[model samples]
Target: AAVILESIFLKRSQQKKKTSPLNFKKRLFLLTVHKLSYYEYDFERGRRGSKKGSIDVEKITCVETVVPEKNPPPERQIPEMEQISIIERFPYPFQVVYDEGPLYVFSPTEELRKRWIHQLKNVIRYNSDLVQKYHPAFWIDGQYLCCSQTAKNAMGCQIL
Candidate 1:
């Protein structure tokens, strides 16, 4: 299994060398989908839309159509709102050094994602395996960048 994995990674790198940065990110996401076949046992089996440890293609297709429409006419138009940065709402701002391109590393944990969602008003896409496996390091480049001892440790408030 390990040899097979190595070969798969090698093949991927060879393929990626010819692709654009955005395409590389998309391919990385697709590779994550392919890897899901290895851990179907642990995914939620009882949920109506959850099966095969894969993405809900049906949900993805219907997302645009699912937005609600306001029917009754109101006197005033709703005020336009400016979008806020995800980093702005963080209680304890951690300095993220950007020595390279546009990238940031985050440790995958349910609580950290929840807090980030609440504070930033943004949704984060994550693979179940990355969260379940308790991966200690996450990166944008092939090289390692950030290491979080634990998700909780990374998000907690700092003492003055």
Candidate 2:
């Protein structure tokens, strides 16, 4: 059986344009060794709100604890939410300068917050080591990279 490292229900703010109104949606979060998957439910429709979205473990640059500032600049403020930083290699919002965009996830309780940070950081560290073993030039297709025949076979590896 596949191991699920951790799973939880969390409140994630729906992505909106800078001027748009803020809204939060509940999501089921599943963390495995290789990805983070989230599913949102539509209560009225009695079904999933949309297809699940996943973040591949390899794209994660770092995972760390972050507290929403007590008073942040107008553009950066997220009122009344505690967040964890899931730093990635792309851009949108919540990216530290020189850092790509990040997913700022809010946990409902302090215990959940700490547990998530601990588990995510562990997974991130393991994935980072795997990334370091690959040659940058060998990255070929989206979500896959060429690997030497001598390298171990894995889902993210391609042998072209």
Candidate 3:
């Protein structure tokens, strides 16, 4: 049980704000044997910022890729959040499903996303129960786009 994977990712705010420009942030993600965590990534100084959050690896029931939207959504139009340079919406995305909810992470490339998805799935395979169902579409506006389920913790309607 040692460090498994670590890299930078564009993570959506767990705040899940629908319209906030600060919704997506670049974070330094780390995956250990027991838990996964992320820290704020400061680009200028080239150092990690404070700890943001972590999810118990055992709690993650699913890890898979997500198809990108036809047109990337506007995440950099506003000026308030761009002082350090507005973040571009990432193209290759994936999700990790824990008992609490889903965590959306965008990687710089499809290869990166695929690797993380594979590593996460491999590490969490020994968990109590694995989900055979998952949402194919993005969870947006407090609902799953694929099933339109209102509950954040709704059982995935699409089979994996």
- Listed per model in order, the count of residue pairs whose N, CA or C atoms clash below 3 Å is 0, 0, 0
For model 1, the superposed segments whose C-alpha errors exceed 4 Å read 1-132, 147-160
For model 3, how many clashes?
0
lDDT of candidate 3 over 18-105, digit per residue (tens) = 4444367878998887989999877789877788889999888899887566566553222233323224535677998888788888
What are the RMSDs of all candidates, in order? 17.7, 12.4, 5.0
Give the lDDT of residue 25 in candidate 3. Answer: 80
Q: Candidate 2 versus the native: TM-score?
A: 0.49
Query: 2 or 3: which has the higher TM-score?
Result: 3
lDDT of 1 by residue, 21-112 (tens): 42111011111212311121221352223132323211121000011113311211122223322211211211111112112212122344
**lDDT for each residue of candidate 2 in 99-144, tens digit (9 for 90 to 100):** 2234555554456666776676676774543332222222112222
Best of the two (1, 2) by TM-score = 2
Give all TM-scores, in the order shown: 0.18, 0.49, 0.82
> Candidate 3 local accuracy as lDDT?
0.77
List of clashing residue pairs for candidate 2: none
- All models: lDDT? 0.20, 0.44, 0.77
